[model samples]
Target: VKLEESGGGLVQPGGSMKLSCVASGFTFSNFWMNWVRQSPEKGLEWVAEIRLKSNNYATHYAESVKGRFTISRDDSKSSVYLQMNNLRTEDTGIYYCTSYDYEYWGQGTLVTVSAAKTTPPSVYPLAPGSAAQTNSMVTLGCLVKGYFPEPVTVTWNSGSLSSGVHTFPAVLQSDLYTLSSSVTVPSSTWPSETVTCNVAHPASSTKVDKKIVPR
Candidate 1:
């Protein structure tokens, strides 16, 4: 599945956004189109859905967003749409399109609702000792916490030490967002190398970085 249009960057409170998911490789109308969302604090939630069978179209929605969210489908375009109205800060999260008990899923689209009172994120690098050691690699964690608004980008840099980085999605916590990213480097280089985690938010042009020295 692919999104027809991008959704959820920086929407203001009381605003609205439309998201579309296009399905291929199957009979689009034969299966239910489901919308699911996950927030850092709330985990996963069933948002809304649309189903078409026997030429009849039906929709179902979660009680939380029932009146404000609408789900629809266009068989002619092999696509399903989600329209969210009166968006709130709580509406910020990653949304996915799925079917068959979520056996199939579309790439998630991140939606972040931003307002004037934004908080800069706090970032720290996790200690890399026993928790990060494997046979041939050492992984380090960068913890970023207490941020307002969503969609922070986390990147890693380890000089001359081939590394891999993986970022976990932002999670909501007590009205704020927290995220973690991991960087893996060759164990052989850990003796004298340092790794850095950089967190950047669109709300502020200034980015934050934290460095970790292997111990």
Candidate 2:
């Protein structure tokens, strides 16, 4: 399902849906499976899931997910589903699900409260960036352009900073892939220490990291 818009799409206020895109022309595992939500009325919410060997990343949905919406992947079928609960009238709109930079999207599914159906799919550290003070905040980020349809995570750790992950929308275009995440470190942990930003993909066994001083 890597064509113009070969993925699935849906929309809900506080509800959920499940949809999937099957692969054929290429080795599905070679690419990352990503899901993007467009609340054009609100904004586009994006999240991703990866299929590495067999250990898939945990379902990562948007923070807006409340009632019973969930995302899940089926390695056996090379597909994903977005499930929703307690469907509401505001839950009516167009939703799309796909893989690999949204190279393809499902036949735009219009989930009206009545038409509702279908389904589918950081942290920190130390140094001048502390855990107690006000100005001392450490941020973790991943700047990815376009789309890389794989699940990714960013975490930060230090002597005084706790670790956390933040997920953001990924913008994939014909020229670039861009996506990023960030979390603030407590003042107590900010002083003059090293902070790390990691990028993880399902196909890769290892995660790549970048370190910087948050002082």
Candidate 3:
């Protein structure tokens, strides 16, 4: 029912990384395992697939990563592994190990590639979203851009206010990463009360806070 993924993190350009997935809740040898990836630029590509046969492992690889993807599995261990070489920033994505009919899937381990020096992210305010007329609720968004390293944490501040906050996955662009987050607040509190979007990252110890300015 699930594939637990291991070995996900930052890798420099041209570097190789080994990832593995452990299957449970089902007979691993009975079904084919698939390796798939969702790139930061957007796209789900089937990297490869492998199945246990009588004498050998029957496998097929996607042309997109042919000769670059090295896939294997251990039936006894109920696990599958993937190794990729000559990796570039474009390969940054969430890698998933799945079952034959695509019935089971891994948690989709995220792998990021970068060769740039650490760059602190810049925080900016996003255009306000439409306010809720019936319930008197409004949205505040923050943008964190041009950062090195993988994920950046984002939080909101509105006196004892919590919930309705969401931060999307970081997108790779121009060798940098960008992430955005939004929080919903009471519409009537705007102008009188100031809300801040707090961004946290390894680039610095101080959290970057961007105030939401109402138009």
Candidate 4:
């Protein structure tokens, strides 16, 4: 199975995004088309699905995004489409199309929903002390300001080092929003290591990746 999405890479808050899943090498109507998503910091979420049998069509969606997500299909094109409206920051993620039992899967497509007025987040590494010590801890912060809408994700990585991440809720400031996130890393693996912070939002087509090497 193969999938494609439409929206010019970014969708506004009130606009909609559509995805097409094309079935091949099998009977298109023999299986159901399912829409699934994975966020940078979350697990897989089932969005919606559609199936056609005997000239009748049936659709269903996860209760969380039911009203805003719609699923449809066209037999003539041998494809199914997933459409989402009233977009939000939390809706930014990688989406995939699959068949029943997830036996057949398609490559994932990233969907970002952000307002045109939003701004990119700033990320930096935090210092614990002047000298590096084993078994200590390291921290990194991502500061997002002057952005509209709510919900942004921040992730940290440093080669095989295990880290804990936390994102504070958005705070209102002069009609804009500001959010902060921090990730803690163990000092045992900090020597000659490069730590990276990934900040993702709906308004931008690509996630921001910032890397820093501790001395």
Candidate 5:
């Protein structure tokens, strides 16, 4: 079974939001559709569950989200929706749609509460003065800056030559974010080879492939 997830993207605090999970490859009406969430503080939180019954539907909600969230389904569309209101920054988290056993799950939708609008990150693979050598190794680094809604995916050399690359947590400033990621390699190797920093964020124009300059 396949469950494809989506959300309202970015929402402002106190705004309402709705998330969706579209299921396929299984009987959508026969299984229970569930909503769950994950965040830094709250580990794993099961939000809601709904299953079609004889003439109506049965539903359940977690104590944390009860009365604040709603789960609805459309069997004909093979989709389930989770509606939430009274948004707070603490409510920011990734929401997932799944089956009863959690065997069939969807890629989660990230919902964040921020006042700033969606902004794509600026990727700096060269980052003038960023190339530094340590222990005879070229520590090629990348800078991700000015992105809103937090977090961006960073990979090196399309992740093929990404050995021991480390990415740090994002820092917030002025409602934007900055992240740093780096990879170390023999100084000699960088001059003779090509490297790229692959960056991806929800606000990005899909993705960015930034070619790194030789030291």
Candidate 6:
């Protein structure tokens, strides 16, 4: 069947939206509800999907997506619902529901997750020459950048280093957020010791890291 996109109305930021599709030729239980995104410039971005009968959820987006999303079957209504919560600008996309083989797809609904107000980048300590710090006690601070939340992890050489005792700022003025943590290395270890700051983000493939050393 030709992909047809039709469902509920627009879902506001931080609000919830339930979308669905129905078919007659095939038993819906054998199919999966898949959602994809298509941008005017770029191609497709796989978002998330769910098995109809089992209510199983699979997300290719961010880790935070878990529990925030759910799939359900309404045999009486002859449809399946893909529900999302705590919506954000990043949630906007072209969503579709289809069979397991993706042989059939919904027409494609365009949902826009609007961006929040812009902010500034937070600043923190750097090496003497703005380069990485060497052998000293490496102190890294996390500040807020725009609306992005803080309280993320800051590590060293892939090791956890953030102490719950330190305070994180309320709001990040710029696009940069600051997280501070320190690792003490013997001056002799400076050359071989590589200190790193890493933050866990949802949508991205891996955590982000920035390194430094005291010279």
Q: Which ranges of candidate 3 are over 4 A from the true structure?
A: 40-42, 118-145, 153-163, 166-174, 186-215
Ranking by lDDT: 5, 3, 1, 4, 6, 2
Q: On residues 12-104, what C-alpha lDDT tens digit does candidate 6 reach at each position? A: 578888777776666665666566656555567655666544554333443545667665556655565677888876666667776666777
lDDT of 3 by residue, 120-196 (tens): 89999974645634458877789899987766777788324467788898887886899988788777887478888
lDDT of every predicted structure (CA atoms): 0.78, 0.50, 0.82, 0.70, 0.82, 0.54
| TM-score for each predicted model, relative to the true structure | 0.60, 0.40, 0.66, 0.53, 0.81, 0.43
Model 4 residue pairs with clashes: 113-202, 114-202, 114-203
Q: 135 in model 2: Cα distance from truth in Å?
A: 74
Go through the candidates in order and give the clash count of each: 3, 73, 0, 3, 0, 28
**Which regions of candidate 4 deviate over 4 angstroms?**
1-8, 116-215
Over the stretch 49-131, how does candidate 1's per-residue lDDT look in tens digits? 78776747788899989899998888898888899999887888899888758867888878877665567898887865655
Q: What is the per-residue lDDT of model 2 for residues 117-210, given as tens digits with 9 covering 90 to 100?
A: 3211122222333453455544445454332333344454522334455657655354233567665665455334445666554323435565
**Top-scoring candidate (TM-score):** 5
lDDT of 3 at 188: 87
Candidate 2 structure, TM-score to reference? 0.40
| lDDT value, candidate 2, whole model | 0.50
Q: What is the per-residue lDDT of model 4 for residues 1-215, given as tens digits with 9 covering 90 to 100?
A: 44444332467777888887777876777888788888757789888878777647788899878789888888888787888888776888888888877777777777767665555554555545567454577675667666554445666663243347777887867646787777676656554566676767655444667665553
lDDT of 2 at 193: 46
Looking at model 4, report the run of 10 residues with the lowest lDDT sum: 1-10
**Candidate 4 Cα RMSD after full superposition onto the native fold (Å):** 6.7
| lDDT of candidate 1 at residue 86, scale 0 to 100 | 93
Q: Kindly indicate the candidate among 2 and 5 with the higher lDDT.
A: 5
The list of candidate 2 runs beyond 4 A from truth reads 1-17, 47-51, 114-215
lDDT of 6: 0.54
Residue-level lDDT of model 5, residues 86-188, one tens digit each, is: 7788778888998997889898888887778888988887532545434567677789898887658888888887665999999989988999888877766
Give the lDDT of residue 96 in candidate 1.
88
